[PDB]
Design a protein around this ligand. Structure first.
Ligand SMILES: Nc1ncnc2c1ncn2[C@@H]1O[C@H](COP(=O)(O)OP(=O)(O)OP(=O)(O)O)[C@@H](O)[C@H]1O
Ligand SMILES: Nc1ncnc2c1ncn2[C@@H]1O[C@H](COP(=O)(O)OP(=O)(O)OP(=O)(O)O)[C@@H](O)[C@H]1O
Ligand SMILES: Nc1ncnc2c1ncn2[C@@H]1O[C@H](COP(=O)(O)OP(=O)(O)OP(=O)(O)O)[C@@H](O)[C@H]1O
Ligand code: NA
Ligand code: NA
Ligand code: NA
Lengths: 334, 334, 334
C-alpha cells in the first residue's frame, strides 16, 4: 500500500493499528516511550514506534496518514491538530464544532436531536434541574433543584448567594434520568453510507461503584461523585430502538454537510435512554470512542452484515483502502 | 429450500433473518414501513419486506413459516396468532400458558421451579413482601412491607384503606433479593435435546440508572421506579450453577409435554440469583428473548460445542432445515 | 499426545477441557456424579468422567496432568493438593502464598502493588476505614469509620466494647472506593512471556442488586450486604491504563521467582480502579479465574495478537503442547 497508517499511542491505537494490519497497511504508533512495549511486545501491532508527541517530519517521510485517536486532540491541542501538514483521516473542521458548547448545541439542534433543555433564568424552572457551577470540572459541586424557591435556598447554602444580582455565570439544565447508552457509528464518504458499528456502556469511577454502597453508609459521608472513564461494557439495544438511533446519526451527518464541510468516519452520540424510550444526547464525539475497543473481533451488529470480524478500526482501514482503490484518497483526508 | 422464513419486523428479526440466511433460507420481514430500511439497507437480512402487520395471504403464497418474534403476540394479539393459517414455529398453545398468571404459576409449580411465595391474606406475612396494586402497570405504586402491622399502616397511607373489608384485590408476594439473570434455552424437537444457548442481564430504565444517583439526592425526590427494557448485557454464570439452571429447563419442557402438547424452540426463565445460590424465577418467556441478540456471532456457551457461530436465530433455522431434511417439518410447526 | 489433560468438574472445567480438545489432547473431568451430564452431554468436552473427588490412581494410569481449577483447592484442601502424585500445571508452592493473608500481603508489597493501608491501632485512623470483625465470613458485620472517635462509638454499639482493653483481634483497612476490575494474565514459562488474556467485572449477589433498590426502601430495612459470586461480565479497560496493569503483572511474576520458585500459567489481580486512575488490589488469585469463562471464543485482547480464538483454557493447553514439543514438560509441572 502507498500510505502507512499512523496514530497517537493511546485511547484506541491497538484497535486502529490491528485493523490497519488486517487490511494490508504498515503501521506507525507515536507517543510516550513508556507505552512502547504495549504496541510492540504485548500487542505487536505497530511496525514503527516513534517516541515523540507529534513527529511531523518522520510521518511525512513515512507517507503516513493519521487516524485521529479519541484523545489525540486532548494530548496535542486543537490548534496543533488544525495546522498538521500530515494528512488527517476525517474533517479537521469538526473538532471545534464538537468541543465548543455552543457550536455543539447548534449542531444537535439542527440535527433535530433531543437534548436537555437549558435554563438561562432560575425563575423559569418548572421541572427538576441539574445546576453546574463554572468552570465545570468533571461534575464538581453539581446539585439538583426542583423549583425556583428550591434553587435559591441551595444557591445560598452551596454558593453563598444572598442577592440575585450576585449569581455569577452558571449552567442550569433539565435533569434527564436514563440509562447510559453509547451508539458507535461509521459514515463512509467513499460509499456515502452510514453504518451502526457497535454499542457500549461506558464504565466510570466512582459513579458506577456507589450503587454497591448501602444507602445507610452513603449518608454518613459527604461523598464526591466522579465520572472518570475506566473502561467499557458491551451492550445491544432493544431492536425497535435502532431505527431512531440510526436516523439520529443520519441527521447529524446531514447537518454537518451544511455546517462544517461534512462528517465522515467514526462518531458517537453519548446519551441516556429514558423510561419513555427517548434517546437524550449529552454530547457528540465526532471521532472514534473507546467503547469500540470491545469489538476487535466484530460486534453483534457487524456480524449481521459482514462475513468477517469488523472493528471500527478495521472499518477505518477498509475505508482508506477503498479510497485508494477508487482513486479518491484526497476526499477522505483533510 | 422449500419454505421461506418469515418474522415480524421487531424484537429480534435481525438475528432471526440473519440466522435464516446463514442456513440457506430466503427471508421475509413484515411490519411497519418506517423500519424497512433497518432490514433491507442498514442490515440487509430480509429478501422481502411486506409493509403490513400480518399479510397472511402473501405469506401463504411465499411458502413462509413464521418464527415468532418475542413481541409478535403483543403487536398482533393472542387470538389472531392462535388462528393463523400461516405455519408457526413452535407450539401456539404455550402462548396462553405463559401470559396468564395462573397458568404460568401452575407450569412453574409442576416444573418444580422455585418462585416467589404468594400471600393471599396480609395477616400471613412473616417475611418481607412486595405489594402490587391491581391493575399492575410496570411497577406502578409497588411498595414493601415487613409484617402485618406494617402492611396495614401502608395500606392506609398509600391506598386509603381504613377497614380491612375495603382491601380490594391486590398482589402480595415474597420479596426476593437477587441479581437479574436470564438464561436462554433451546429445545430441539428434532433431536429431543435441550441446549443452553446463552445468558444475559437485561438492561432497564430507570431501574439501572438509579444506582448512579447518590442516596442523598434520591431522598430529596419522590421518584418513580420503572423497568422499561432498553437493551441487553452479556454474562456467563458461575460454572457450578449451570446444572440446576439446565435441569430447570428440562423440567419446564417435561411439564409442558404433559400440560400443553409440549415445548420446543427457544425459551427463557427470567429470575434472580440470591446470595444463597438459589435461582428464583419471576416469569417464563416461551419464546425467543432479546438477550439472544448479543450472540449473533455465538456465545461463550455455543463455542463450547460448535465449530461455528450459532445464535438462537441460527439455531431455529438449523432446526427447521434439519426437520425438512428428515421429513418431519410438520412436527415442529403448529 | 502423550499426556491427557484433567481437571476438577467445576469453576472453569468446560473452558479448560474445550481448550484442551482444541489443541489435540484427550480430556478427563473428575468430580460429582450429578454434574456429569454438563461435561458429557450438554457440553461434550470430557472424553472421560470419573465420579470421584480425587481419583489419583486412575489419573496416573491415564497419564493425566491436572490443570488446577479455581476452586480445586477449596474442594480438596491445600494439604491434599500439595501432596498430589499426579502432575499439576503450575507451581504448587504459590497456593500458600495466595491464601495466607500475611504471605499474600508480602507478595504484593514486594511486587510494588498498591494495596489498602492496614491500621493496627484504631487511634491512627486519619482517613475513612472499613473494619472487619474476625473471623471474617464474606462481609459479615462490616462497617465504616472516619476517625478514632467515630470508631470507638461504633465499637461500643456494634461490638459491645466499653474499654479499649477489650478490643479483640479485628481488621482495620483503608476504605478504597472504585469500580471492580479483574485483569486476567498468563505467564508462559516456555516463552518467558507475560500476556494479558482478558478482563472482566465479577457479578455478585446481593451487592450488585442493591443499586436497583431506591434509597428510601433500603433505609426501612436492616440489610445484609453479601458478595456471593454469581457470574461474570466482559469489559475492556481504557487503553492508557493497560501498561501499568501489565507492569503490575510483570512485578508479581518477578517477585514470585525470588519468593516461591516462580509463577507461571494463569493468574488474576482482583481490585478496583479509583477516580484518580489508581489500580488498588484486594487479592491475588494465582490460578485461572471464572471471568475467563466469557472468552471461550477469544477476547478483545487475544484477537489483537492471534489469528484464532484463544481462551485462557486454550492458552494453558497451548503451553503444555509447546512444552512437550520443546522437551520441557517437567519445567511447567510440579
Ligand atoms: N442534563 C443532565 N441530566 C442528567 N444527567 C446528566 C446531565 N448532564 C450530565 N449528566 C451526567 O453527569 C455527568 C457529568 O458530565 P458533564 O458533561 O456535566 O461533565 P464532564 O464531561 O464529566 O466534565 P467536563 O464537562 O469538565 O468535560 C455526565 O457524564 C452525565 O452522566
Ligand atoms: N417477588 C419479587 N421480588 C423481588 N423483585 C421483584 C418481584 N417481583 C417483581 N420484581 C421486580 O420488579 C419488577 C416489576 O416487574 P413485574 O413483573 O411486577 O411487572 P412488569 O412485568 O414490569 O409489568 P407487567 O406486570 O404490567 O407486565 C420486575 O422486573 C422485577 O425486577
Ligand atoms: N479495603 C477495602 N476498601 C473497599 N472495599 C473493600 C475493601 N476490602 C474489601 N472490600 C469489598 O468488600 C468485599 C468483601 O470481601 P473480603 O475480601 O473482605 O471478604 P470475602 O473475600 O468476601 O470473604 P472471605 O474474606 O471470608 O474470603 C470485597 O469483595 C470488596 O468488594
Ligand atoms: Na463533545
Ligand atoms: Na411470561
Ligand atoms: Na487470594
Amino acid at each position: 500500500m502507498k500510505v502507512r497508517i499512523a496514530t497517537y499511542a493511546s485511547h484506541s491505537a491497538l484497535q486502529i493499528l490491528k485493523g490497519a494490519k488486517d487490511e494490508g497497511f504498515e503501521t506507525i504508533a507515536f507517543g510516550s516511550s513508556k507505552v512502547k512495549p504495549l504496541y510492540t511486545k504485548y500487542f505487536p501491532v505497530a511496525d514503527y514506534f516513534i517516541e515523540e508527541k507529534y513527529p511531523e517530519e518522520e510521518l511525512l517521510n513515512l507517507n503516513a496518514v493519521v487516524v485521529p485517536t479519541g484523545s489525540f486532540v486532548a494530548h496535542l491541542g486543537i490548534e496543533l491538530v488544525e495546522n498538521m501538514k500530515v494528512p488527517y483521516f476525517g474533517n479537521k473542521r469538526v473538532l471545534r464544532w464538537e468541543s465548543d458548547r455552543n457550536l455543539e448545541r447548534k449542531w444537535l439542534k439542527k440535527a433535530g436531536i433531543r437534548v436537555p433543555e437549558v435554563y438561562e433564568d432560575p425563575d423559569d424552572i418548572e421541572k427538576p434541574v441539574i445546576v453546574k457551577p463554572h468552570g465545570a470540572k468533571g461534575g464538581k459541586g453539581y446539585f439538583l433543584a426542583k423549583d425556583p424557591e428550591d434553587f435559591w435556598r441551595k444557591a445560598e447554602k452551596f454558593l453563598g448567594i444572598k442577592r440575585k444580582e450576585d449569581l455569577k455565570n452558571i449552567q442550569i439544565q433539565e435533569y434527564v434520568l436514563g440509562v447510559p447508552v453509547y451508539p458507535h457509528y461509521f459514515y463512509s464518504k467513499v460509499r456515502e453510507e452510514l453504518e451502526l458499528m457497535s454499542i457500549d456502556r461506558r464504565y466510570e469511577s466512582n459513579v458506577d461503584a456507589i450503587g454497591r454502597i448501602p444507602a445507610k453508609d452513603q449518608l454518613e459521608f459527604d461523598m464526591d461523585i466522579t465520572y472518570t472513564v475506566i473502561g467499557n461494557i458491551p451492550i445491544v439495544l432493544r431492536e425497535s430502538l435502532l431505527m431512531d438511533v440510526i436516523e439520529a446519526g443520519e441527521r447529524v451527518v446531514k447537518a454537518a454537510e451544511e455546517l462544517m464541510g461534512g462528517l465522515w468516519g467514526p462518531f458517537c452520540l453519548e446519551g441516556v435512554f429514558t423510561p419513555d424510550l427517548e434517546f437524550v444526547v449529552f454530547e457528540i464525539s465526532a471521532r472514534i470512542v473507546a467503547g469500540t475497543n470491545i469489538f476487535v473481533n466484530g460486534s453483534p451488529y457487524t456480524w449481521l452484515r459482514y462475513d468477517r470480524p469488523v472493528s471500527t478500526g478495521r472499518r477505518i482501514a477498509m475505508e482508506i483502502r477503498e479510497a485508494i482503490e477508487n482513486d479518491m484518497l484526497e476526499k477522505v483526508l483533510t
